RNA sequence: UACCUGGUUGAUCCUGCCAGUAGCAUAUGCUUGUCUCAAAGAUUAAGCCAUGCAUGUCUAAGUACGCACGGCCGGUACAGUGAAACUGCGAAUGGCUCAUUAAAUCAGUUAUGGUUCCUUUGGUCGCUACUUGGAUAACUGUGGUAAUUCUAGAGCUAAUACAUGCCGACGGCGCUGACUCCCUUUGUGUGGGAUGCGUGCAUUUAUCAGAUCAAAACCAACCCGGUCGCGGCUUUGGUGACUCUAGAUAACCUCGGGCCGAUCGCAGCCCUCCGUGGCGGCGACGACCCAUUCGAACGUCUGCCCUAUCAACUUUCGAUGGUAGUCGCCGUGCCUACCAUGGUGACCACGGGUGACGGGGAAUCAGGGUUCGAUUCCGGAGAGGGAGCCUGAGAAACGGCUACCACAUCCAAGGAAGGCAGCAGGCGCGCAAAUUACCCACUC
RNA sequence: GCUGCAGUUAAAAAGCUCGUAGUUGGAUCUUGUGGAGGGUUCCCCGCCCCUUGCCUCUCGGCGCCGGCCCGAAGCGUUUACUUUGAAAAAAUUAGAGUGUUCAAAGCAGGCCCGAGCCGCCUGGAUACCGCAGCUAGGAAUAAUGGAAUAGGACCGCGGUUCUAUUUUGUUGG
RNA sequence: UCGCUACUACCGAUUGGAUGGUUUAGUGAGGCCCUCGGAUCGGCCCGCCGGGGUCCCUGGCGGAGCGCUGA
């Protein structure tokens, strides 16, 4: 049907070329998983050697890495912002490598509060004090205070990210390939790629 | 040199990373990228432009995703229109036994040319060899350029 | 069809370019006479083997000592 | 067309050292996937119907190895075209006798037996050396042999020792000059030397240079060469004529003057 | 054996061609006693095909309630020979033809550090359980159509088919740290430690480490020989070259949609032991992952018959190249979006022709050459013409399927069935090509 | 008609001249005495001037009572040519052995008592296999190259900027 | 030059004829992929009877919701 073949198209010169055979299957290719954002829908294909091979129709959640800080989690996914091949795999909501998406921040913020011992997403008292500050302040003897110094001075984030968190939301990259492995999975934007991608998302609509 | 990121999607090489961790450096800086590089095999040198150089391309021999295996060549640089990719000549004589003489015939090559060469022009001599299909026409690799057994660009004292 | 056969021969002789030479004629005859043979091929047969024969010591006496 | 692998050979397309006729028949026996390439194997019809002559045609074959009376390497075997191949053990302990695949200086495998307490072992040449999961050492064959734990000082090249009961590895001979070796490929096919010089070159193939007892030199590819002594003595024991590959002028001469084949 | 002769004139010497002479392979005429070999519907029409055959298969070892045949009598699972049917494997090799096809196929030479691989051979095979579930075929019984290797409704019963799922051998080691003890209230050096969480190999992504080199001088704190300033050092493997192999950390995990045995046949055993706890000898079959073997696929360098009454050609209708992605077993304009303006040619491109399948080879031949190669070995392509696809390790298969186009068989006019460029045999064509024979004894 | 034809009059030199690609292109840059094999001076060692042309290391064996020597390596300005290695299906062709009754073919076959030998000896060679790619010697012939807007070299000095992070007892400065 | 008898090729009215390859615009069988659809067939939840047992197992008849949940 469709197939991927070298001997349908013209030669440096310029010239044509004549069929050499009929279409063999080792020349096969199939039509694109198109993947969306939705309840998890995955289909499985037969491959040549008898192989097994997974293709992703809808996604809802992923697996992603916080590079910086060594700490990675399941997380559910929120949009599509930006894609550099093309606009109207943004205009229809497609899912693909080097794609760049919005996160669920709440994750790493129950990670980094219970590591440190400090805030991270928060706006004022009303949000601080009536609730789980039993996670930041417990009876600790002889590891207190002074002992968190092995936290507290290395606890500082960069201030595009205090920036994200307050709003509930991080900027990530997909690194798997989703029509092919079945999965969408990443890493956080960070430094001048978040710098750059600020920038394109900005001067394209804002 | 100063800005890279011409393009849509952002450029860096793979393996590399950047620490978002004690990241102070007072009143002045260093870079914050290390290099990476590799030895080629077979008796070549990788230049220094390689090394201390700032570009991004993935098919290049020395900073780069290829290795170079199989035949190796040499032409002349003979047209460079196309960007990180050039021609070279090759020439060649052809023996018909039925006469006791000899035939001249040539073929052409499309290259690919990395920086870190950046001085070369048309009827220098370079040397190449095989890689993966690197694009539709191209299968080599320029790993060395001179102009040795030849005269110069400009006058005798160059 | 593929089959067990082989398929190797050669004749054994050579008929001569001049085919009424007078000179040739009688000298074949003195030889089938004096001998006893039945045809000119049986004479013919004898040339062939005697001229191979030659024509292998003439190629060896070209090669160094 | 080839819509998949075949499973014929014809007698003209077969290996030249088998020395089949030319007229009995269209097809030869296709050696059976195994242990050695398909070019450097002896099939074991071949060796019991033409070269030992214990049965006139197939069928007799057939019901010889039904039986149970053929081992290779020590393990019995029922398929009749195994491919058998160099430094490999035959035992018939219904005749009593044993037997080990090694080349004539002709380039063909000769018919060689040996004493019972020699059949215990054989040589292999080294082809990988590698580490698998938790760090463990493997070591490959020549003969498609894995051994795990082998001794760190066991390099690429080497030839190792193995008794046949275990399978595990008893001794070894490094690869370096002085050593004896024999020719396993190309012109030089089942001559015998001492390795005396090795040139190199990155990429492309190494060539080996080897003298003979009776003075004479030759060369091939690194690939070609086993090695099968420890300085100047062999492992195992050597067929008539012992590698020094004669001339037609020398092999003319001794074939007169000692009057054999019934003169 | 490196060769010539007749023919222009009234006669002579030349140029030059016609005719003779020898071989080879297709047809054809006249003629024929013995004996050993053995080519044979390629040339025209890859035109059309009546009839028969050309692919099947069971061991001690997957499923035996066929009264089908049978024994000394009995089912102690159950004897023993065993039709049929279910399940497994093969049918992608072999055989036939030469239509298409001029950098294509093919040959020599090299490469996968850019992939996949039934089987064989060697590694590997311990993070209700003294044995689970329901449901069909053969068979028995009742039918429909002019008709086919067409099949429907009803009653029974199996598994190495289909689907579930323990037990045993968690006792891991890292991270948390209520409390507690000692020198120094903290910090900082300790040893214990209640209690939680994760903890095999495969899979997706992110991070870490990978050790070796030349020479001194001060300071905080100390390894250690010793005590309130000097001597001395250590840790997977490999290539010309890896973003290799092995190792450590945080998570993922495929489920109905990765592995870790609810299987079969021979001889019996050793005992806190009288038929019990097991441990064990020989196997058979099966499955995830490495390495092999048989290959397949894609790529490198050089090599081609005639033609200018073919001189310029290609180019978002992808042409040459760049960046990101999709698809695919994998490299790649293979395809999509954006961008650049390239690429080949008198050293013959681009276009047209070929009674063109390529090569090993064959005829003739002083030396040098000319002509031929449909044809038993090797590579390619195709089963009336084009296209699409199922199953499988392997096919874009035609002794598989679906449709259009060209032919064409049967009919109760509603419908159903088809592919000899396999072996024999027939029609048509033409100068032109054999028997609708016997057998698996040999080779495989 | 390359070896190997012909063009005043038999068939046939563009009316004449210029000119890009193609083919072709002048001379020139280190030799004789001594020893071996062989001759009565020339082919291999060592020399008027250089004999692998240089060179000095360092991981790595040799020779001897540390230091100095002799085999790798950097490599000899780049190629054609020539000579030698390696590596390339079989059948066919050439070619060795062998009384198919001879031959064309084939790959066989030959000794010894009787049968008491529970048999013995022996073959299935070898050459050729353009071009292109791989490899080690030779250096005539033919291509190709260096300092004229001077650079080779000395264990030679000097300013300045970058910089591995070794040796020190280590982790840090 | 004109004339008689054979044979081969050229030009051309005829909007000639047959076969084959390119290609504009319109139509389009059948397979595969995707989004839907839901004929029909089961299990688990509520009576009575029976076998075993401290009302549950579990065979069967049978009706309401035909829930929930699978093909």
Redesign the pocket.
Known sequence: ?IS?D?W???????????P???????E??????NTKIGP??????????????????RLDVG?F?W?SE?????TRIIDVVYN???NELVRTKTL???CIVLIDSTPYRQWYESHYALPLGRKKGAKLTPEEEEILNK??????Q??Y??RKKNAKISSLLEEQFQQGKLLACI?????????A???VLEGKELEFYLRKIKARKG | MADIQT???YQK???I?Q?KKRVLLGETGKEKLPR?Y?????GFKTPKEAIEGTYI???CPFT????????I?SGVVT?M?????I?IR???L??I????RFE???????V?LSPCFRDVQIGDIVTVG?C????????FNVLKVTK????KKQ???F | ???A????????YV?????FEKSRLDQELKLIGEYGLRNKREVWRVKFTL?KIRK?ARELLTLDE | ????????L????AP?HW?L??????????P????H???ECLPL?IFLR?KLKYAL???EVKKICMQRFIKIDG?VRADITYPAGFMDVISIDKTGENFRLIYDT?GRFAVHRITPEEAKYKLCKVR????????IP?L?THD???I?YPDPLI??NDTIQIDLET?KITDFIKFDTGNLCMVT????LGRIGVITNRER????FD?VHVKDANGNS????LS?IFVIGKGNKPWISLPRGKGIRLT?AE?RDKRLAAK???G
């Open positions: 049907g991927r070298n349908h198209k013209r030669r440096k010169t310029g010239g044509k070329r004549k050499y055979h009929k279409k063999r299957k080792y096969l290719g199939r039509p694109a998983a998890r829908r995955i289909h499985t294909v037969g491959v040549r050697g008898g192989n097994k091979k997974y293709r992703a129709l697996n890495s590079g060594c700490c990675t989690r399941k550099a091949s093309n693909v490598k080097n009876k600790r003897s002889k590891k207190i002074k002992k110094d092995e690194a798997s390939r989703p029509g092919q492995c079945g999965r999975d990443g890493y | 393009e849509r999607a090489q793979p393996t990373f620490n990476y590799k030895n080629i095999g077979l391309d993935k098919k780069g995703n290829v290795s170079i295996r199989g035949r060549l047209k229109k196309m960007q990180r990719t021609v090759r020439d060649y052809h023996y036994r039925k006469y006791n001249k015939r040539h073929k052409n090559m499309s690919h095989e993966r299909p690197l694009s539709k026409t191209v299968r040795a057994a030849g005269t006058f005798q004292k | 069809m593929p089959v056969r082989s398929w190797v021969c050669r004749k054994t008929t001569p370019r001049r085919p001229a292998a | 067309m080839a819509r998949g692998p075949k499973k014929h014809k007698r003209v397309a030249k020395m006729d030319k007229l009995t028949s269209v097809f030869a026996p296709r059976s996937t195994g242990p390439k398909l070019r019809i033409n045609t197939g069928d393990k002709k990988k050396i590698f580490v698998g999961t938790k760090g493997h490959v498609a042999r894995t795990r390099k690429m399978g490929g190309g012109a030089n070159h990155p990429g492309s060539v030759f060369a091939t590819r070609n037609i092999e054999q084949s019934s």
